[PDB]
Design a protein around this nucleic acid. Structure first.
Length: 423
DNA sequence: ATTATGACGCT
DNA sequence: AGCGTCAT
């Protein structure tokens, strides 16, 4: 008939990663309300990462620092580095590389963002099942693992975890669960080990979710934070989904999700099972329809792509609102600034990863535009030279000036190296 | 004036 | 190729 349980996939998330990096570096920041901020003068600078001690007070991403101090007077703040008049994330990219390299020892890794990796454990699980000469799995192996939906049928939370885990293993040991449930379990054992190795070797804690696909792994990861992991089995999906808002599933958090809500007249992920594949296809098109039909039953095929390195390297800076760029000499200077950071990062890349970028994408925004990008233009990237690239980015945007004066002003500059080639 | 990134889809 | 959506 059908089955969507052949893979074991994990999604790991470095808990408030930027804060961890700063906290490792500055011991005084550890186990305290803490946040990372970039810039300082306009309203204290924007928060981009928040510790759980801080979140408890209601501090969030995309909050001005001055407002964050109101919610949390004892909030400690670390400031992102500033080179060539802009924020620079090199410390965090390098800290991110430390982690990915440890992760690749265990399994195939897909870098999803600077703080998230997807992990395909299917092969590692099979091997591990030989290594265990029929040996049964004890709770001692899963010391930070939650089993979603369990226990079924004590006050402290660790108390609840224990009970859920014991119920699951007792059922596993007596052949009441399924083969895929065994595979997920073994998968979770490997993730504990992977998570223990990350912490020993970097000092960074993190959360993780384990299921049969990427969407479920990412959802599972969020169920129990910080520094805990959660196992979502195929059998838990109907209950989990029955009360799970559509927007919390990955890729339904925007307009597609909003239109699924208002067109079909539903709220929760489970409610999609009522509809036929063709029906969903008729509202949202062929690709989305098919994907929704299977996803709401806990089935997804999107593979874990083997890719530790990013496939584009870019520099970006916004210039709002009166800060907008208005002269030619000024536009050249920021282009030069962005280019110089881009050069340094490209060289480090070539030495590290045996590859060369070949294309330069230049993107722009003008004041009072309906869209986060106004124009996007390409040119050839032949040599790692800031002046060349800056001069060229100027060449492909020169025509957008309507008026030594630049009108209308530029609210955004962006330079991205792409189309990488080995050697 | 919710940054500075980064992935992938549609046409 | 250029633009849009979706993430942190």
């Amino acid at each position: 008939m059908a089955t969507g349980q052949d893979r074991v996939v994990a999604l790991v998330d470095m808990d408030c990663f930027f804060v961890q990096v700063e906290q490792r570096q500055n011991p005084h920041l550890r186990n305290k309300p803490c946040a990372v901020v970039q810039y300082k003068s306009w309203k204290g600078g924007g928060i981009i990462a928040v510790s759980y001690e801080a979140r408890a007070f209601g501090v969030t991403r995309s909050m001005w620092a001055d407002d964050a101090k109101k919610l949390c007077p004892d909030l400690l703040l670390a400031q992102v580095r500033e080179s060539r008049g802009k924020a620079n994330l090199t410390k965090y990219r390098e800290a991110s590389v430390e982690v990915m390299e440890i992760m690749s020892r265990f399994a195939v890794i897909e870098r999803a963002s600077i703080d998230e990796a997807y992990v395909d454990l299917t092969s590692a699980v099979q091997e591990r099942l030989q290594k265990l000469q029929g040996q049964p799995i004890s709770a001692d192996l899963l010391p930070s693992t939650y089993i979603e939906g369990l226990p079924q049928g004590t006050v402290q939370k660790e108390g609840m975890r224990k009970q859920g885990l014991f119920q699951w293993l007792d059922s596993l040991q007596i052949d009441n669960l399924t083969s895929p449930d065994l595979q997920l379990t073994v998968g979770a054992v490997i993730v504990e080990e992977m998570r223990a190795a990350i912490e020993r070797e970097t000092g960074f804690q993190c959360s993780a979710g384990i299921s049969h696909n990427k969407v479920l792994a990412k959802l599972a990861c969020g169920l129990n934070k910080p520094n805990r992991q959660t196992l979502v089995s195929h059998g838990s999906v109907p209950q989990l989904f029955s009360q799970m808002p559509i927007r919390k599933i990955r890729s339904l958090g925007g307009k597609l999700g909003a239109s699924v809500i208002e067109i079909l007249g539903i709220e929760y992920m489970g409610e999609l099972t009522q509809f036929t594949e063709s029906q969903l296809q008729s509202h949202f098109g062929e690709k989305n329809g098919s994907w929704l039909y299977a996803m709401c039953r806990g089935i997804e095929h999107d593979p874990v792509k083997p890719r530790q390195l990013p496939k584009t390297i870019g520099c970006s800076k916004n210039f709002p609102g009166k800060t907008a760029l208005a002269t030619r000499e000024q536009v050249q200077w920021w282009l030069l600034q962005l280019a110089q950071e881009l050069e340094e990062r490209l060289t480090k890349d070539r030495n590290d990863n045996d590859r060369v970028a070949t294309q330069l994408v230049v993107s722009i925004r003008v004041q009072g535009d309906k869209r986060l990008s106004s124009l996007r233009r390409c040119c050839a990237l032949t040599r790692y030279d800031a002046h060349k690239m800056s001069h060229d980015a100027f060449t492909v945007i020169k025509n957008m000036n309507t008026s030594t004066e630049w009108s209308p002003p530029l609210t955004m500059l962006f330079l991205c190296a792409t189309k990488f080639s080995a050697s």
